Write a structure and sequence with these properties.
The structure is cut from a larger assembly and holds chains A (88 residues), B (117 residues), C (237 residues), D (104 residues), E (70 residues) and F (67 residues). Chain B is 18% helix and 30% strand. With 117 residues, chain B is α/β, with parallel strands linked by helices. Chain B has one domain. A five-stranded mixed beta sheet of chain B has the order 3-2-1-4-5. In chain B, strand 1 and strand 2 form a beta hairpin. Chain C is rod-shaped and about 90 Å long. The chains are: A mainly alpha (88), B alpha/beta (117), C mainly beta (237), D alpha+beta (104), E mainly alpha (70), F mainly alpha (67). Chains in contact: B-E, B-F, C-D, D-F, E-F. Chains D and F meet through strand 4 of D and helix 4 of F. The structure holds magnesium ion (16 copies). The site of one magnesium ion (MG) has 3 residues of chain A, from loops. Chain A binds two RNA strands through helix 1, helix 2 and helix 3. The PDB classes it as ribosome.
Chain lengths: 88, 117, 237, 104, 70, 67
RNA sequence: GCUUGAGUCUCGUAGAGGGGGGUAGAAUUCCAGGUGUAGCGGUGAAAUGCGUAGAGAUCUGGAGGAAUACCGGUGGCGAAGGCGGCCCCCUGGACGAAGACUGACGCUCAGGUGCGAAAGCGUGGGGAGCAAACAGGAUUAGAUACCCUGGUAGUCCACGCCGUAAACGAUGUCGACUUGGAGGUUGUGCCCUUGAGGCGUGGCUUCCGGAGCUAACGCGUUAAGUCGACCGCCUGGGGAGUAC
RNA sequence: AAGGAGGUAUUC
């Protein structure tokens, strides 16, 4: 999965400080990074249904986090989806 | 016709029959005897006594070579599988080593279907 | 003498010749032509073998025995048959990072240094050209019967266009070539198939020859020197 | 960097090339900025069963810290070289710097 | 199950030693098992039944060391 | 009983230690069950992997009659 | 707003979880030789079959395909189907210890989408063993079967389709509460580790059993007990999971 | 296959 160094880098970008590991923006960025990483894996392994089931949870969970964020703070939702290059 | 005095007796002990073949260390056969060709058919062919008589015939149709020391290799879960070793020992042969050489696949080919008798 | 094998080891065979007398037959003394036959396959423990006493160590109570002398050395057979410079065809037994071992007739393994296969192909295509078991013809460069090695060479089967190029163009000829590479230190100019000359920036025309020489330009430069070590023809305009 | 334990068996007829093979492979890791943590030449050893009609293979053990790419090239070299009868490279979670039971 | 015939031991001893060695290897049982093909469900089912009866026997045996049957 | 490895707190069985593994393979060369030896389950799995790796390297024999 | 539900991060652990690529040894089959000679094979008993053009047996070499003995375990992992040599690469989940962070972000889910044993279908490969159909020999009153000798599809690979099983724990998912015992497996804390000890505390799992429940059998903290949220389904047997 | 012993089986 995501490396120990790559998680620290993302937390720094999207959080108030180094220890803000659970903010919604940080969580969405981490899920996005792993989702974007895995597309290369599934280009070569179409038949990896077991791994793709875990990929769906990441996609589905990012949807739930984004919906919560949109409801609670539209401004950060707009800002975050632009920064992460997402639709909806 | 030559003289060896050290050979190897391969016993093939199948369920239905018992083949004894005596050979040199190199693997060139000297003689062979079977229970089915020793005067036993069907229910009697697959008996320990029949294998003993097969061992007698093989030890009698090979002593032109003057074998004195013998090595015994048993293969298969046959009926006799043992009377052959005893018969060889009694026929005037020194048994040096006994080895079980029954082939065991390490989970290879699929065996035939079970008999629904 | 005739003796009975008492013990067989991978480094030698113990043959009891007399009561209480065991001589050691080296596996190197077991066969001239196939140095790589394990004793377990030629002789069994208890076999009666005719062995010749080569050396007796009274002090250490060990007799070096020869089965070697009953058979025939293929190295002498090779030296009588093949003079220095003989062309021998043989099968590639194995490919190694340093060279090819080639089995010749008589069970001899010849070693070809990889440096003699081609003057112009670095490293990777030479390994793909030869498959294990392929038949290759090489000329016997040197037979060392003392170390039991034959050095074989492929260089004598080809004819270097480099050598023909240098012989055709005497020192001082002006030669025209197309620039294949341009460096800050000089330009690499191909003058013939496999024959490349080097025209230095200080002799190309300015601190950088790239302002004067483009990749692919034809440059007329004088053949001033040949570097036989690097195949580098030093050129000057 | 991933840590790999590399055991390969060289044909006994090339026991004289074992120093050269060790130097060549060692440089091919050190040049790729990896480390070498253990080098053991167990030497000529009797085989439990014949491998390619041989007994008495030469054993070399290497414990290495190197990236996956250079190790990949190393394994391909083993395949192409016909002096190594067998080779096994295993991933290890941490380095080792102790004599093997074979040396002891 | 290789057997080397030692000196001074009778051939009966040699035959006894070989028989015990084969039994320890369990070759005959393996051959009898491999005579016919047993479906994975059957092999899986048979293994389960042995465990169930074996466990029941232990617990029943445990009760016998307690219940006054005398 | 008396699982030997857990007594010494061995982290990993280390296939290279042939002297130890000879205890856990039979005369024919197949592995002895943990029920007989007394080894714990976790060490048993490590022991099986170690023996299988040793067989591949020909430190140990698969069967008694390879040749 | 809050931190107790749900998540995130830090360190580890166990595992036949998945996909791709290598490789190892045993064994079966066929082929090429050496030895050797008259049987082999099969059955309750036989015959069909193979064999003097040399079988079977034995030794050596080679080719190929498939599966991975022992370990192996009411052991493990996975949502289920299922997953078992070894090694590498890519990858999913679960659990534990301590701490920090977000601040209800949750549960269930019609339709929808996906996965889904075996058999089967399509295109193209592969084919050692096994084996529907089929051929033959027997048994039988008959034998379109059971048994024997052969044997095609198929089983294997790649890519699509199919979408069903006693797909079963015949037990929908999520949460809370309610006496005990013996174990298995995997973490972790403490004490004298005196020497594999003792004492706690998490996860998953097998058996027994109390109250209670049940028509009874039985279930019994992993409930079929006490409750709460949401969903699927039942309405006598046949006709019929059939017709349109 | 038949008979005796030990255990859930071994530390030894
Ligand atoms: Mg994740
Ligand atoms: Mg049959
Ligand atoms: Mg058949
Ligand atoms: Mg589970
Ligand atoms: Mg639906
Ligand atoms: Mg199918
Ligand atoms: Mg098909
Ligand atoms: Mg087809
Ligand atoms: Mg049939
Ligand atoms: Mg249904
Ligand atoms: Mg099922
Ligand atoms: Mg069920
Ligand atoms: Mg149902
Ligand atoms: Mg109960
Ligand atoms: Mg219908
Ligand atoms: Mg139906």
């Amino acid at each position: 999965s995501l490396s120990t160094e790559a998680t620290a880098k993302i937390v720094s970008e999207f959080g108030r400080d180094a220890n803000d590991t659970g903010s919604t923006e940080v969580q969405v960025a981490l899920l996005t990074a792993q989702i974007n990483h895995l597309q290369g894996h599934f280009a070569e392994h179409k038949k990896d249904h077991h791994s793709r089931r875990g990929l769906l949870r990441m996609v589905s969970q990012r949807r739930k986090l984004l919906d919560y964020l949109k409801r609670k703070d539209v401004a950060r939702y707009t800002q975050l989806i632009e920064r992460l290059g997402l639709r909806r | 016709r030559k003289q060896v005095s050290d050979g190897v007796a391969h016993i093939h002990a199948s369920f239905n029959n018992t083949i004894v073949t005596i050979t040199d260390r190199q693997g060139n056969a000297l003689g062979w005897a079977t229970a089915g060709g020793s005067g036993f058919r069907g229910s009697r062919k697959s008996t320990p006594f029949a294998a003993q008589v097969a061992a007698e015939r093989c030890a009698d149709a090979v002593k032109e070579y003057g074998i004195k020391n013998l090595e015994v290799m048993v293969k298969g879960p046959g009926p006799g599988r043992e009377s052959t070793i005893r018969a060889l020992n009694a026929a005037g042969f020194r048994i040096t080593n006994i080895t079980d050489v029954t082939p065991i696949p390490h989970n290879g080919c699929r065996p035939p279907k079970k008999r629904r008798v | 003498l005739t003796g009975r094998v008492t013990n067989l080891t991978d480094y030698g065979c113990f043959v009891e010749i007399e009561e209480g007398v065991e001589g050691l037959v080296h596996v190197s003394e077991m066969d001239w032509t196939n140095k790589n036959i394990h004793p377990s396959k030629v002789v069994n423990v208890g076999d009666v073998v005719e062995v010749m006493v080569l050396d007796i160590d009274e002090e250490r109570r060990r007799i070096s025995l020869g089965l070697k002398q009953c058979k025939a050395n293929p190295w002498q057979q090779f030296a009588e048959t093949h003079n220095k410079g003989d062309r021998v065809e043989g099968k590639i037994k194995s490919i190694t990072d340093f060279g090819i071992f080639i089995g010749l007739d008589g069970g001899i393994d010849g070693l070809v240094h990889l440096s003699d296969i081609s003057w112009n192909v670095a490293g990777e295509e030479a390994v793909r050209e030869y498959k294990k078991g392929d038949e290759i013809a090489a000329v016997v460069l040197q037979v060392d019967a003392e170390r039991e090695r034959i050095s074989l060479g492929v260089k004598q089967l080809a004819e270097d266009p480099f050598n023909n190029w240098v012989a055709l163009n005497k020192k001082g000829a002006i030669v025209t070539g197309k620039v294949t590479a341009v460096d800050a230190k000089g330009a690499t100019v191909e003058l013939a198939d496999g024959v490349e000359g080097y025209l230095r920036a200080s002799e190309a025309s300015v601190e950088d020859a790239t302002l004067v020489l483009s990749v692919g330009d034809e440059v007329e430069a004088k053949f001033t020197g040949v570097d036989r070590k690097n195949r580098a023809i030093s050129l000057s305009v | 960097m991933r840590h790999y334990e590399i055991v390969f068996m060289v044909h006994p007829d090339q026991s004289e090339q074992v120093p050269g093979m060790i130097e060549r492979y060692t440089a091919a890791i050190t040049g790729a900025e990896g480390k070498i943590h253990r080098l053991e030449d167990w030497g000529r050893r009797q085989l439990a069963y014949p491998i390619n009609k041989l007994h008495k293979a030469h054993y070399v053990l290497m414990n290495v810290e190197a990236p996956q790419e250079v190790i990949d090239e190393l394994e391909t070299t083993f395949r192409f070289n016909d002096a190594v009868i067998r080779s096994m490279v295993m991933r290890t979670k941490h380095a080792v710097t102790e004599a093997s039971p074979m040396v002891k | 199950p290789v057997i080397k015939v030692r000196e001074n031991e009778p051939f009966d001893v040699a035959l006894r030693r070989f028989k015990r060695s084969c039994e320890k290897a369990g070759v005959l049982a393996e051959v009898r098992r491999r005579e016919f093909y047993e479906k994975p469900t059957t092999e899986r089912k048979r293994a389960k039944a042995s465990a169930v009866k074996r466990h029941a026997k232990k617990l029943a045996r445990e009760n016998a060391r307690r219940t006054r049957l005398y | 009983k008396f699982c030997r490895f857990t007594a010494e707190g061995v982290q990993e069985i280390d296939y290279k230690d042939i002297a130890t593994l000879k205890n856990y393979i039979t005369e024919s060369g197949k592995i002895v069950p943990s029920r007989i030896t007394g080894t714990r389950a976790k060490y048993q799995r490590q022991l099986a992997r170690a023996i299988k790796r040793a067989r591949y390297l020909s430190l140990l024999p698969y069967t008694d009659r390879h040749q």
